[PDB]
Design a protein around this ligand. Structure first.
Ligand SMILES: OC[C@H]1O[C@H](O[C@H]2[C@H](O)[C@@H](O)[C@H](OCCCCC3CCCCC3)O[C@@H]2CO)[C@H](O)[C@@H](O)[C@@H]1O
Ligand SMILES: [Zn+2]
Length: 127
């Protein structure tokens, strides 16, 4: 499978699946930027704001997610964004391969807010 990407937006600081890359530019400051077309157009800093897409986690492999890990989290508010957070604590549940009822306490990177998310609402970083 070919590499797929997601890009951070400067408007809300959430991440979005990148459909394609159009062009690029260099700031007199030195930074390299790409113009990305999203799925479903921005200039994003390549170094910080573009990265290989996050991956969904299956119930039978929920054990690979540990305290301290970085995760793309579905943050649903009053507004539903996919943004970065770190696992602070994990409550392991009793379940099979069909569904994961573990609870993941996440601290969002932007504002250090905390939320209890289920596996269905998180994606891990590759590797
Ligand atoms: O992190 C890394 C990330 O994993 C890496 O993929 C990202 O590079 C991604 C930019 C290159 C993606 C694009 C795809 C086809 C068109 C030309 C290239 O940069 C980040 C900088 O550290
Ligand atoms: Zn689980």
């Amino acid at each position: 499978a070919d590499l797929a990407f997601e890009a951070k937006s400067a408007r809300d600081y959430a991440w979005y699946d990148v459909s394609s890359f159009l062009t690029y530019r260099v700031l007199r400051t030195g930074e390299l930027e790409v113009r990305v077309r999203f799925s479903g157009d921005e200039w994003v800093n390549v170094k910080t704001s573009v990265r290989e897409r996050s991956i969904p986690v299956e119930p039978s492999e929920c054990g690979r997610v540990n305290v301290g890990d970085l995760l793309l989290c579905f943050q649903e508010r009053e507004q539903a964004l996919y943004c970065d957070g770190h696992v602070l604590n994990i409550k392991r549940g009793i379940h099979d391969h069909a569904r994961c009822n573990c609870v993941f306490l996440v601290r969002y990177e932007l504002d250090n807010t905390e939320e209890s998310l289920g596996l269905e609402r998180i994606c891990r970083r590759p590797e």
